[PDB]
């Protein structure tokens, strides 16, 4: 219900187990591994969020017992992208994690995204993105800042993860905690590659 | 030399270039590339699993081409199971090249870290116990009526991503890095996701 | 109540407040900043427990508002090392707090150490050891395992810390998550530096 | 060179090696040695506070005597204070040689940080702004009436302790290593251990 998936086919199914938790079944990844989910909304409440990477049905975390994700074709994610294509901001109040296979997790919000308590459980690598990803000939080449003003705040709870985190916005505000093994942080209006590489800078004249 | 794949289906094919690269199997519908192998050491030039559906650049072993073993999916995760009773010693980084993955390395007979580390694994275990299978589908892992040994040496063990070990007992001198480290001693069964399931204990 | 100090001078002063979190008031340090606190008992409860490392009145994480700790004389903790000299192994099932300056915390107890859901909070390096600290002229030279076949033991809700983490026994045995940036495990009958470098081991012939 | 000691009480003697040497003030009652500075700028070599009761080895400045400023006690909290308008540019280690302690630097101007990093130091902050005293004891921090920045350069931040990042602004390019990051934007005050007691906001 935090969670709004878009209509088309890069929509996800959203469900809610006991709690309130939602269960976020991804849509199907490229041969990359590239599971490209695109949402109305994408808010995580104190329940968490749970994304069913799983190819065989066993326990999560915060979801109890998940069945397979049926989108999954014999390959899990290795990266789960998801990107806000509404106007809507995100805040995220509670942990997501990744069921199934451990994979790298990124949300794009170029309106904005505030993390209070908000944290990722078995993922590899995790970013926050105030801005687009970019894609070419349809694959993903990158990420994009540019003329965007929008801001990236972490609340008084902070932010627990494991691992690399990227936190990616014209702005950042913070109040907290950032709990992770290294931060690559980047301000401004830029361009990045898919590993968060600055390629290029828009400044004002 | 150090890696030496068992003869059957489920062995990939394994070459230098003395860095070791192994062409994994095919992984199956639960997106497992089970592999098995006499031997699997690793040196200090280190090894990659070849989990790439196109050609690129490897950071152990230089310029790679696609693992043609792959029809158009690449692994979930990569499962090296030692089936010999020839004990592991891992001097060097394994890597996943191409896409990244899970990787396992399960070895009964004991396993040795000294210097060893995973690159582009997004989480990475080692147990000193065999994979259990009902029905040809991987249902966990087993370190029952078994008393070997993990051993952390002298110059320990590195990745940026997740980590498991996993053994009766475990034995170190030196230091782990990693993004998390779930440790789990004892003659136990588990879950894939290292859950314990069941624990062995003397009368 | 679960933290009971020794008689003698380097008996700290342990007391409760709401929750039953314990408070300690460390020794006077050393010039070279080590409190040598000496213990009958420690073990640390689900309410925790808080190092008053403090030379002004301030808010703990654990145990709310707390005065200066009167022990101290112009000069904080650098490392607080806490050892049990009775036969009485510990249990940590809370997390521990420096509250004040941050410091260096040691807990060696030869008798064994289990942390189930144990912690530190604004410690620098926390370090448990089933050994015994050795001195030399009054001064703290390393750590000894030497003659101890005992157990460091993680339980099921895991080890939580920040930065770096010594776990020094001669035996480890775990069953769930060590939480930490990089953890130097030493097992076997050993001696090692201050700073947990090994020096000499001791072998079966 | 690069830093440059305020001239009365509270200036502490410093020197070079191109590494500098800081010989920082006597600690009051409440264990800070407070150091204010018309400049305060780490180069390439570093800085190393000296608070050292016997001489030994620095990792940044070789071979270093004991600081006779102290007097038998060693700093809890190094605080080292610009006084002046000028900004600080930090790209190089600070290493607090003797006993570790808690470093501070408070600087309203703003600070850069681009390659620097901290050494021996429980617990290192950041802070573009100034501390708040009340009957000569430090009370917190003030980023009140300040619009200035915290920049992370390319090269970025290493520390293996604690970490605080506090300015009414924070910029980034690159990557921040340390044992825990604390960071908090805005016009506030704070205690000292940087809860925040009180913001300004406009009308």
């Known amino acids: 219900n935090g969670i709004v998936p878009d209509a088309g086919h890069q929509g996800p199914d959203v469900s809610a187990v006991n709690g309130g938790t939602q269960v976020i ?3 199907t990844p490229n041969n990359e591994g590239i599971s490209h989910n695109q949402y109305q909304d994408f808010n995580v409440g ?3 969020a749970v994304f069913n990477n799983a190819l065989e049905a066993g326990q999560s975390q915060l979801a109890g017992h998940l069945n ?3 989108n999954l074709n014999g390959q899990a994610a290795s990266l789960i992208l998801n990107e806000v294509v509404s106007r809507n901001p995100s805040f995220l109040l509670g942990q997501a994690e990744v069921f199934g296979i451990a ?3 990124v949300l794009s919000n170029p309106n904005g ?3 209070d308590g908000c944290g990722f459980i078995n993922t590899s690598r995790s970013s ?4 687009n990803p970019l894609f070419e000939n349809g694959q993903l080449k990158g990420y994009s800042t540019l003329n965007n003003t929008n801001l990236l705040s972490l609340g008084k709870n902070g932010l627990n993860t494991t691992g690399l985190l990227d936190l990616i916005a014209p702005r950042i505000d913070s109040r907290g905690k950032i709990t992770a093994a290294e931060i690559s942080a980047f301000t401004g209006q830029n361009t990045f590659s898919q590993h968060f590489d600055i390629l290029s800078s ?3 004249v």
């Open 25 to 27: 079944n991804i849509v």
């Open 103 to 105: 994979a790298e997790a």
């Open 46 to 48: 104190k329940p968490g």
């Open 128 to 131: 926050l993105v105030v801005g």
């Open 113 to 115: 995204i505030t993390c």
């Open 68 to 70: 397979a994700n049926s």
């Open 202 to 204: 828009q400044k004002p």
